[PDB]
Paper text:
Cytoplasmic dynein-1 is a conserved, minus-end-directed microtubule motor critical for cell division and long-range intracellular transport in eukaryotic cells. Dynein, a member of the AAA + (ATPase associated with various cellular activities) family, forms a 1.4 MDa dimer composed of two copies each of heavy (HC), intermediate (IC), light intermediate (LIC), and three (TCTEX, LC8, and ROBL) light chains (LC), with the IC, LIC, and LC known as accessory chains. Cellular and structural studies have shown that dynein primarily exists in a pseudo-twofold symmetric, autoinhibited Phi state incompatible with movement along microtubules. [name] plays essential roles in the activation of dynein, including relieving autoinhibition and helping assemble the fully active DDA transport complexes.
To visualize the conformational landscape of dynein activation by [name], we incubated full-length human dynein with ATP and [name] at room temperature for 5 minutes. We identified three major species: individual dynein motors (Open), Phi, and a third state similar to Phi but with two [name] β-propellers bound to dynein, which we termed Pre-Chi. We obtained six different Open subclasses, which we categorized based on the linker conformation (bent, intermediate, or straight) and the presence or absence of [name]. [name] binds dynein at four sites: between AAA3 and AAA4 in the motor domain (sitering), on the stalk (sitestalk), and, in trans when dynein is in the Chi conformation, at AAA5 (transAAA5) and AAA6 (transAAA6) on a neighboring motor domain. In monomeric dynein, [name] has been observed bound to both sitering and sitestalk, and to sitering in the absence of binding to sitestalk, but not to sitestalk only. This is consistent with a model where sitestalk binding is weaker and depends on cooperativity with sitering.
Residue numbers in the entry:
A (entry chain A): 3477 to 3795
B (entry chain C), D (entry chain B): 89 to 297, 307 to 410
C (entry chain A): 2785 to 3210
Write the structure that this text describes.
């Protein structure tokens, strides 16, 4: 019974073991494309982002460097759990905002978000809620004191109104940091301020048509929250369902949440089973914890079987 | 031979290595034959120069130890590292005794006067703190520099201390009057190393041209002899191709030993104004040197994580 | 000529600078052959007639002209010994101004940068031939009295960092005005009087680093013009500040030993000290209109200042920085097949290129095609945002981070899977 | 004391724990006071033997690493595992350098002869590949073994290469002429480990009964020393009660240290051929040992997930 239950995992584990040798060779090209996208394609819109990615892919193909061409440039960088957390924290479900959240999570220079819609501001507020984030503006009188407090205390900060840029942030954004042994010290204006390692700053914009000086363009990373055809189509379709077919819309939302939870629990199954069978520390035939793993596997086989009817009812609702 | 004519000769006697980081300072032990080195990995390794073998490793610091110094008896060792700590060690047990805190920034050097009851230290907080060894307390703090102080050093009787700092000045401070005696500024670039005249060289400098005489080497590839009393330089010695990091006298009181960042060790005679020998020390920058009072041995630390022993012939 | 670029003005001032450059290059050297004389003539010629140029074609024309003029006027000479590729001169490796080679210069500069990271700026730097040439040019300007600089280059190219490194290693003290909002001409004049007091009365070297973005009024540029041209700003010290300056200047003259009284000779000595001690480095971005505007509104910036055109990083610079940053990571495939189309974007690429060479060339292509896409988007009609070498450094750092992260995840998952299959086989 | 009589004494000096899996091979660094350990959980942990503190781990392998090796420079790390690959590591950045392929079976031994230019690799595929350092490509290939090759070790001069397999023979080869200069069939069981006689041991073996000499330890209840000049067994060491696993020579070239599966660290001699000190080491079987050339430290590697260091007096 154990082997019959675990053959379903063996038949794919051996396949992935064989695939790993090929997957070792695509790492360089795939990471090259991913890094170029995540450091270069921030300000541009969807069409220009796709044009740049196509140009880079064509050059890698012409240079005989193998890259995984059957993966999504956002699925390669994002995990399912962090995608679920972002979708919970008011992020739009389109690939553009998913890439923007990828760049916000994996930033190297401090990002400059441009959200005319105001979605990125509330997304950042919801995401950095456990850490005490504080909203402030460059035009606010209590900006220097708030920046000093955030720098001293290691609290994330979001600065709106970057059009009126206040140039005291040049050492912070350039990371001109003096290391006092193990201590970290940075100058700011007329004072030397202890820079805590767990400090991040986001600069915000509510106007797409703002011209920035090249020094700021070098110092910050642009994250453009534009609007795309697929996103607007999905938003309008959801609003039409909410207004006209409320029962259909609410059961669609409930089924989408249930499908997400079911996929999360299936991934939890896979991780738990792999880590439990990894650390048996002996013969699997001579233990009862293996029987506990078998019971977990059969219960989760039952739930992954019951996911199919949810898929069917989602299919009828979407058609 | 005669300690008057002790001069190192190529090649080195031993090539001692084992540090994981560049070596900052090397000094000799006065009583028992120990050469102890300080490095950038918080390891103060103890070596034996008589037979050229590794002896022991003393790890008490958490960041790069900068300078080490002894007392009149040689049984007490002090060290200073980038983690704002001064540590006093013994050699009867090779055990750390008392840690010393109170400086704001990187402590740059420490020194113990021959009376042995007090220890001075210069740091990056532009101050020299007057400590005491008995209870680990700061007696008072010298103040008056403008920038980071490179190292501090007392005279023979422990009443005049001098210090070199990044502001192109070398200030002599009186331990008695607690006031700067004669601050002189003549080097164009940062001064890095200083030294004092020994008891058996006043006649030598007087013939080459009382006292007291103060040495000072800087990063402008020059070495200057200064008289503390007159507040004026005697002369400027040139010849180094890069930054000078250490200057020291000789047992006979007639020679000047100095190492620089030009990957050479140079020993000079100041009577006839010129360099007399240029010894290729390392393959990288030479950080420091020390000269044995009673033995013909010279130790020179460096950045390439090696300590070399030269025999004075 | 001046219609090609506004700063392309030539005068016997450059011949005088050439003559004196050769003079202090031959002053303490005391034993040189004609090969060395031609070499220093060529080096000063390059430093005076090539720094202000914009286009690599013009730079190649200058190099060819130096070679052919030296050949024409100096027959039966050793061309290879006289002129070569690096032609670098330095005074860091020896007390005298002697020629140096790139390898020893790079080793010394890397060691000095290791020393420099601890003291002022703990930001890593990558070395290449343009950086070596730039730090030597900035050092050469900083050594001479009244040495002022005008660095022309795109933002994020490292102009102020190279200036800071050279200033630190030459004993200069770096000063920046720390501009912010509501920063007015009165605050600028207070900063100017503080730096002038420090440079004249206190007798210290100051590298007054300042930027075009730090200029907020025409009074800023007027004061800078007067200070650059004359070494003094009349009307800056008024009221009790004039009396304070006179007291401090008399104290400084007493400290340095010179006996001074009255006010006229004291102020002249203060002007001489400011001339001998204060260096101004001015950094802006290249522009067709802004450069002409600065030439009109401040002739001192184009007369009394030595102009260096950094520009954008070249493809050779991008290739070398990418290769040096991507050297610690595993990138070599022994079974690599070179494509016969050979898309190459960096000339003098090794043939046949290996895998790491090919992908660093690919990174250079990625930067180049972003340049082209930005130009196309600007020409279409939409708004554009300037691209900088900071973006290339960000891209190469993201490449390193993503490579290490994905490799670690893949190896961990493969190890877990292998142990799981071994246990199920058991 | 003199290093000619450095035997470990009970109890152990440091008991280092932290390994999840059996430990395979343990070696000492040439210049740094640090040492690495290879275990079965696809990790290479590094420990400071002087103070017994954990430094870091090196995880880049996906299967159990079998053998590790240094060079004379002390900058490049070799490691062979069961994942059909060998991996190079640098000691200044502590990162992977090159992943190499070419063996379709488990690789059990890896070493670098002191020129620092290429690597040997003994694997289960009845062959030994010659791979390069600066490139990572196969240039030469040994052929002639017909069973699993267990351990490969290059001679100190590097002109002779020695390999022992599971076919009751220890076939030594020539690196240049690709020829097995001495093959013999006298072992009764599988030979496990080999070692090379130093210059100091050359004269000792010559006066015991010129050179070079070789030693092999085999599962046939016998440990014997080989000679390449005559191709004959010069002596046989008997007295261990179980399967032998690790054996090595002393720094002075006069003593012998061995470990077996009876939880014993039995030191012997050639003049008298009896064990003067049998010492218990672990609770489980023992894998590997290492004795420092310039330090009195013996490290014990065993499958009991624990590595111990012993002090020699
Ligand atoms: N040669 C180089 N190698 C590596 N990094 C560099 C180099 N030059 C510049 N950088 C990076 O680029 C940044 C440039 O900052 P800065 O000099 O203030 O910009 P600007 O050149 O506009 O003044 C620095 O923070 C530095 O980290």
């Amino acid at each position: 019974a154990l082997l019959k239950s675990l053959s379903a995992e063996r038949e794919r584990w051996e396949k992935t073991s064989e695939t790993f040798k090929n997957q070792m060779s695509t790492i360089a090209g795939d990471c090259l494309l991913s890094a170029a996208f995540i450091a270069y394609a921030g300000y541009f819109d969807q069409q220009m982002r796709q044009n740049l990615f196509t140009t880079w892919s064509h050059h890698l193909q012409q240079a005989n460097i193998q890259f995984r061409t059957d993966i999504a440039r956002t699925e390669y960088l994002s995990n399912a759990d962090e995608r679920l957390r972002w979708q919970a924290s008011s992020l739009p479900a389109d690939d553009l905002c998913t890439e923007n959240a990828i760049m916000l999570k994996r930033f190297n220079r401090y990002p400059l978000i441009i959200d005319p819609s105001g979605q990125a501001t509330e997304f950042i507020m919801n995401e950095y809620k456990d850490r005490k984030i504080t909203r402030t503006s460059f035009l606010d009188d209590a900006f220097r004191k708030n920046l000093e407090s955030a720098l001293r205390f290691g609290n994330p900060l979001l600065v709106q109104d970057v059009e009126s840029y206040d140039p005291v942030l040049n050492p912070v954004l350039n990371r001109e940091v003096r290391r006092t042994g193990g201590r970290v010290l940075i100058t700011l204006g007329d004072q030397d301020i202890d820079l805590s390692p767990s400090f991040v700053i986001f600069l915000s914009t509510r106007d797409p048509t703002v011209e920035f000086p090249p020094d700021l363009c070098s110092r910050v990373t642009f994250v453009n929250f534009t609007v795309t055809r697929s996103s607007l189509q999905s938003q309008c379709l959801n609003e039409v369902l909410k207004a006209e077919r409320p029962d259909v819309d609410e059961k669609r939302s409930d089924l989408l949440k249930l499908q997400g939870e079911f996929q999360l629990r299936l991934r939890q199954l896979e991780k738990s089973l792999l880590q439990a069978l990894n650390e048996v520390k002996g013969r699997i035939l001579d233990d009862d914890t293996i029987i506990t793993t078998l019971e977990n596997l059969k219960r989760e086989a039952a739930e992954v079987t019951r996911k199919v009817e949810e898929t069917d009812i989602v299919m009828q609702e979407v058609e | 031979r005669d300690p008057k004519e002790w001069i190192p000769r190529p090649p080195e006697k031993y090539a001692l290595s084992g540090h994981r980081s560049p070596v900052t300072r090397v000094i000799f032990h006065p009583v028992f034959s120990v050469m102890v080195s300080a490095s950038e990995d918080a390891t103060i390794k103890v070596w034996d120069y008589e037979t050229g073998d590794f002896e022991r490793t003393l790890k008490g610091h958490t960041d790069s130890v900068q300078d080490i110094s002894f007392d009149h008896s040689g049984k007490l060792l002090a060290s200073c590292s980038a983690d704002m700590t001064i540590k006093l060690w013994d050699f009867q047990g090779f055990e750390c005794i008392r840690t010393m805190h109170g400086h704001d920034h990187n402590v740059s050097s420490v020194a113990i006067m021959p009376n042995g009851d007090h220890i001075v230290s210069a740091s990056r907080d532009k101050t020299i703190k007057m400590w005491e060894v008995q209870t680990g307390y700061c007696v008072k703090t010298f103040t008056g520099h403008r920038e980071w102080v490179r190292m501090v050093r007392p005279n023979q009787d422990g009443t005049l201390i001098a210090s070199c700092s990044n502001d192109q000045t070398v200030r002599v401070w009186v331990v008695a009057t607690k006031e700067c005696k004669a601050e002189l500024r003549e080097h164009e670039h940062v001064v890095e190393c200083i030294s004092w005249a020994p008891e058996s060289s006043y006649s030598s400098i007087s013939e080459a041209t009382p006292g007291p005489f103060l040495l000072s080497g800087s990063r402008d590839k020059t070495i200057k002899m200064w008289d503390v009393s007159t507040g004026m330089c005697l002369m400027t010695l040139v010849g180094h191709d890069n930054w000078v990091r250490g200057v020291l006298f000789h047992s006979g009181g007639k020679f000047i030993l100095s190492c620089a960042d030009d990957k050479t060790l140079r020993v000079w005679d100041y009577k006839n104004k010129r360099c007399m020998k240029t010894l290729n020390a390392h393959e990288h920058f030479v950080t420091s040197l020390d000269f044995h009072k009673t033995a013909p041995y010279v130790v020179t630390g460096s950045v390439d994580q090696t300590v070399k022993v030269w025999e004075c012939r | 000529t001046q219609d090609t670029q506004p700063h392309y003005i030539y005068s016997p001032r450059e011949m005088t600078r050439w003559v004196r450059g050769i003079f202090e290059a031959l002053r303490p050297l005391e034993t040189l052959p004609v090969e060395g004389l031609i070499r220093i003539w060529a080096h000063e010629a390059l430093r005076l007639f090539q720094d202000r140029l914009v286009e690599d074609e013009e730079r190649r024309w200058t190099d060819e002209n130096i070679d052919t003029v030296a050949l024409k006027h100096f027959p039966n000479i050793d061309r290879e010994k006289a002129m070569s590729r690096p032609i670098l001169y330095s005074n860091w490796l020896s007390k005298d101004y002697i020629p140096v080679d790139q390898e020893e210069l790079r080793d010394y500069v890397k060691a000095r940068l290791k020393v420099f990271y601890e003291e002022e700026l703990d930001v890593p730097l990558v070395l290449f031939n343009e950086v070596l040439d730039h730090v030597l040019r900035i050092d050469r300007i900083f050594r001479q009295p009244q040495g002022h600089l005008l660095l022309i280059g795109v933002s994020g190219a490292g102009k102020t960092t190279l200036s800071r490194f050279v200033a630190w290693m030459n004993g200069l003290s770096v000063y920046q005005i720390k501009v912010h909002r509501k920063y007015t001409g009165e605050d600028f004049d207070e900063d100017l009087r503080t730096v002038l007091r420090r440079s004249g009365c206190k007798n210290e070297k100051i590298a007054f680093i300042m930027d075009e973005s730090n200029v907020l009024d025409s009074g800023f540029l007027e004061r800078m013009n007067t200070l650059l041209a004359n070494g003094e700003v009349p009307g800056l010290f008024e009221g009790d500040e004039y009396a304070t300056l006179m007291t401090q200047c008399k104290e400084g003259a007493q400290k340095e030993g010179l006996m001074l009284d009255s006010h006229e000779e004291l102020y002249k000595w203060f002007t001489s000290q400011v001339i001998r001690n204060l260096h101004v480095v001015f950094t802006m971005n290249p522009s067709s209109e802004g450069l002409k505007d600065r030439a009109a509104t401040s002739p001192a910036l184009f007369n009394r200042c030595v102009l260096n055109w950094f520009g954008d990083w070249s493809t050779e610079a991008l290739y070398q920085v990418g290769k040096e940053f991507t050297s610690k990571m595993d990138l070599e495939k022994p079974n690599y097949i070179v494509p016969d189309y050979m898309p190459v974007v960096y000339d003098k690429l090794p043939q046949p290129p290996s895998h790491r060479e090919a992908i660093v060339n690919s990174c250079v292509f990625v930067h180049q095609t972003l340049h082209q896409a930005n130009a196309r988007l600007a020409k279409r009609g939409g708004r554009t945002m300037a691209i900088t070498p900071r973006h290339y450094l960000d891209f190469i750092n993201h490449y390193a981070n993503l490579f290490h992260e994905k490799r670690s995840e893949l190896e961990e998952q493969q190890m877990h899977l292998n142990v799981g299959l071994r246990k199920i086989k058991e």
